[PDB]
Design a protein around this ligand. Structure first.
Ligand SMILES: *O[C@H]1[C@H](O)[C@@H](N)[C@@H](O[C@H]2[C@H](O[C@@H]3O[C@H](CO)[C@@H](O[C@H]4O[C@@H](CN)[C@@H](O)[C@H](O)[C@H]4N)[C@H]3O)[C@@H](O)[C@H](N)C[C@@H]2N)O[C@@H]1CO
Ligand SMILES: [Mg+2]
Ligand SMILES: [Mg+2]
Ligand SMILES: [Mg+2]
Ligand SMILES: [Mg+2]
Ligand SMILES: [Mg+2]
Lengths: 103, 225, 65, 137
RNA sequence: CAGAGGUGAAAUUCUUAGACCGCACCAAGACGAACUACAGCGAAGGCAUUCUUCAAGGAUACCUUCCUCAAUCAAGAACCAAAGUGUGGAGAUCGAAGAUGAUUAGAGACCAUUGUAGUCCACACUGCAAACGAUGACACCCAUGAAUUGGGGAU
RNA sequence: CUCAGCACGUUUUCUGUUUUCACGCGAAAGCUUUGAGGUUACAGUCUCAGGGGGGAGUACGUUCGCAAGAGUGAAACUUAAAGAAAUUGACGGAAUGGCACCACAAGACGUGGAGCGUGCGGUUUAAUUGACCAACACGG
RNA sequence: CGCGGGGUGGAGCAGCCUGGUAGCUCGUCGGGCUCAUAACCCGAAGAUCGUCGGUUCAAAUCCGGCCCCCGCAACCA
RNA sequence: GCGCGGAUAGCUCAGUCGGUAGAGCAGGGGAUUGAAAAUCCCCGUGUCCUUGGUUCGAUUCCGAGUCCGCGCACCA
RNA sequence: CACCAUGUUCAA
């Protein structure tokens, strides 16, 4: 039973032979780069309660000059993406939905 | 007590900058076999370029500049440009996904003797009416974006001195004149000199250093309170 | 200990549901530095909004949700 | 009583605080802006007795208050902040102690200059700890 | 200057002969992040910085040349991931074996600290993959709508 | 100026990697100009392998290899199913949304300790005449 | 045989006040948790210190004779 | 027999230089908890090896001596 | 992300 056409990974049949693996973001498991689920997070450094304390005590930072943030590009193992609930198991008809941009 | 043996010293930039005296520091008093003036004369001082030229606009806010100590005049640390670098928060926000990213490295030997790398990064953009999914680039054209940048920095910064070259790297005179000439090769979303480093230096001339500071702003910490 | 007023009850938290997540306004004396400051804190016991309570260390905020 | 430099009462003297939060222990380290001179280094494992609390944000907060106590003695009115995770080949996401350390310097009246994350990012990586199958839990 | 590390909690381990941290630098060996994707190249293994080079490869364009030269294949040839082997280098990091912690009823395992062979290069050998699209090669016919890569042609 | 340039827009067309979509096909899952279609209405060409599950990719023989091994490759004996795809259910130290004082929470009042009453087991005895959350002051 | 070592709760081992129902790990019991067993938790029991004498206020210890077990040696013509 | 160190509850150990003992840890209780290990809070507990000179007052000062370490000695 | 091993033979 082929659970999914493309077999879990972005490689088609006659395109690549292999893709060199990356380590998982927390597991450290080596999975191929096209297989491993990849999220680019734009996480702020401070919570909006905590950022308001720091922006008030800052000569630089205010409503005019915004505070920096973290830009890190996480890539996870498939065991690692389910367990951190980055990704979840979806119904059989619902598995083909593909999101091309961050919602 | 450890602050009982510390003397406050003041760090002066060269004459290019508006706020000359930045980043007050400490150092030990001289014991006698080791002098403070030799321990200080290799230190590197990182300062934001918006905290120096005193005219922001979120192009200077995202570059810090490093200065290395040449001469010690009492409480002043007479410095020279060590490196400049676009900060890590601005640089990671410039990458989008579906475009392409060219990274050039050019080795420049100035007319003073300073050898430097400049690490230019560039990014393609889509056009206004463009319906395509990606707008990548031909690798013939990214090698001529790279060839023209490498040719144009080795020509403009090999005539100049080092005070002039830092004034080219600051104020975006070099970068704006490098976007405009490299935009008819490929559509460029952003061309930004990412970091520049002084790699090798000429042998230390004292009169060439004092000329690079104009008038030293005369620190106030060989003092009574 | 500063006396803060519950202006919002954010729902029952914890595993067993005995702890309540509130949003407490600090109610200082209006010339103070930390006046009209609001904190998101965990309350143990039955708490409705507009219920004053004493706070030992007001500089902590609880992790929401 | 104050080993500060020669200025008025109003002037801001800057140092650079180096907040390093791991998931094991958080550091708060104040230097001179060259790094070559250290004013105070207070770590979160000096505030708590158990090793599991050393990474916690409350131990980062108490370590942040011990810094402000000495930085006033040294005459440091304001700070630039360089935050970092462990980086390199490791997890690159900042720990629990990071945002609570920074909030406790602003809450204690230390003026905050320019926030920057200087976590070590490789252009290409050495091989990371753990096997091909990674850490298994 | 008084602890760092590590964990689910720890303990092996490092540390007032100064660890961890912070700054600039140096050395050595690997590796080329983000960009990096249902993208390209290659017969398959496989291939990801740059610049100067060497011989090639396919596609496309063509009112060039050739004129059946082809298809597929026992036998026979040359390639073939990783581990492995031989001889020299290298030896940074990860690390089969092994050693210490711990968990456990036991733990010869997972987890932590290490650490040999190996990892990396040169020249030989091997020819064992979930070597996969679990789909032999070459032709033919075959409805539809988004896209995408390279070449060419119209505006 | 790698500049009679670069990218785009609308449209043609060849080559490549694909995608959600008509027949048809299949035991189904699924495949579908990229066939698993054009097949009992069964023949375009060539080629390799399979013949119930094992034993067994074993033994012997031989050829390669420095060795590890590799290629080739049985039988005696043994078995009545092994498999394949789907359905319905039950289960998960798998997600997700609910619920219950025969669950917890926050508490109350106790049982388990003691003495007795009574039921159950055992041991005795001529005999000490069902049930083991949903048996044990219950068969009134 | 000379010489040297030990006999200890059912098992394996300790034992420096000359002396704690003598101590340890395991086992045996009785109750819990479990649908049940194991693990786990709460408890309780069990010693002729091989044996006979003797030193002593008091002996597993201290001195003995015995019974066992286990070795070291057992030589050069 | 010469100099250095060690003796402080069962175990472990820093001392105020001559004004009264401390933490570490084990032993009995509540807390965590549904049940753990770890974590917490609470009640044991050392005449401070023997002697003196006994400084207002000796774990602390000082003079011998037993005990234990190292590095040194060496003619009945 | 502490630990969490197992349930005799046919038959209904
Ligand atoms: O070779 C092509 C063939 O001739 C033709 N039948 C075509 O089929 C489609 C066509 O599909 C492609 O749409 C692509 C654009 O999204 C386009 O590709 C082309 O893009 C242009 C811009 N870059 C060209 O410059 C480029 O060379 C070219 N590859 C088409 O190929 C549709 O656009 C039509 N609407 C319908 C046709 N049936 O596709 C063949 C290759 O795919
Ligand atoms: Mg492969
Ligand atoms: Mg474990
Ligand atoms: Mg290691
Ligand atoms: Mg009865
Ligand atoms: Mg069994």
């Amino acid at each position: 039973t082929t659970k999914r056409r493309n077999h879990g990974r972005s490689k088609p049949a006659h395109s690549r032979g292999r893709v060199k693996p990356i380590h998982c973001f927390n597991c450290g498991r080596l999975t191929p780069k096209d297989k491993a689920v990849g999220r680019f997070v734009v996480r702020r450094m401070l919570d909006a309660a905590s950022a308001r304390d720091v922006a008030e005590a800052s000569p630089v930072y205010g409503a005019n000059f915004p505070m920096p943030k973290l830009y890190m590009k996480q890539r996870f193992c498939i065991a690692c993406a389910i367990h951190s609930r980055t990704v979840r198991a979806r119904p059989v008809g619902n598995r083909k939905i593909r999101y091309t941009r961050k919602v | 007590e450890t602050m009982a043996r510390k003397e406050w010293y003041d760090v002066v930039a060269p004459a290019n900058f508006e706020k000359r005296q930045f980043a007050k520091t400490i150092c030990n008093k001289t014991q006698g076999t080791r002098i403070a003036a030799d321990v200080l004369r290799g230190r590197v001082f990182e300062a934001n370029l918006a905290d120096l030229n005193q005219s922001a606009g979120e192009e200077e806010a995202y570059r810090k500049v490093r200065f290395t100590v040449q001469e010690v005049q009492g409480r002043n640390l007479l410095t020279q440009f060590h490196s400049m670098e676009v900060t890590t928060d601005k640089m990671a926000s410039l990458l989008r996904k579906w475009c392409t990213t060219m990274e050039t490295t050019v080795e420049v030997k100035t007319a003073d003797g300073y050898t430097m790398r400049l690490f230019v990064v560039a990014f393609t953009k889509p056009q206004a009416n463009q319906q395509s999914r990606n707008c990548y680039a031909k690798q013939r054209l990214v090698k001529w974006l790279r060839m023209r940048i490498t040719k144009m920095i080795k020509r403009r910064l090999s005539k100049v001195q080092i005070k002039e070259a830092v004034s080219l790297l600051t104020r975006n005179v070099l970068s704006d004149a490098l976007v405009r000439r490299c935009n008819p090769i490929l559509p460029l979303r952003e061309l930004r000199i990412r970091k520049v480093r002084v790699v090798r230096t000429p042998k230390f001339d004292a009169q060439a250093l004092l000329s690079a500071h104009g008038t030293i702003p005369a620190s106030v910490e060989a003092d009574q309170r | 200990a500063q006396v803060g007023l519950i202006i919002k009850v954010l729902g029952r938290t914890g595993s067993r549901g005995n702890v309540t997540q509130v949003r407490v306004r600090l109610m200082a004396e209006a010339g103070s530095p930390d006046y009209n400051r609001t904190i998101v804190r965990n309350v143990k016991g039955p708490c409705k909004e507009n219920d004053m309570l004493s706070l030992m260390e007001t500089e902590r905020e609880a992790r929401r949700l | 009583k104050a080993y500060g430099p020669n200025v008025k009462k109003g002037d801001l003297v800057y140092g650079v605080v180096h907040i390093y939060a791991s998931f094991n222990d958080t550091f708060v380290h104040v230097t001179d802006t060259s790094g070559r001179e250290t004013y105070v280094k207070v770590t979160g494992g000096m505030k708590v007795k158990a090793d599991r609390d050393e990474s916690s944000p409350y131990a980062a907060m108490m370590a942040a208050q011990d810094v402000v106590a000495r930085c006033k003695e040294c005459g440091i009115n304001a700070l630039h902040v360089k935050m970092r995770a462990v980086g390199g080949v490791r997890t690159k996401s900042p720990g629990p102690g990071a945002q609570a350390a920074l909030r406790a310097l602003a809450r204690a009246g230390m003026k905050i200059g320019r926030i920057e994350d200087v976590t070590p990012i490789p252009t290409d990586s050495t091989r990371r700890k753990g096997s091909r199958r990674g850490r298994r839990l």
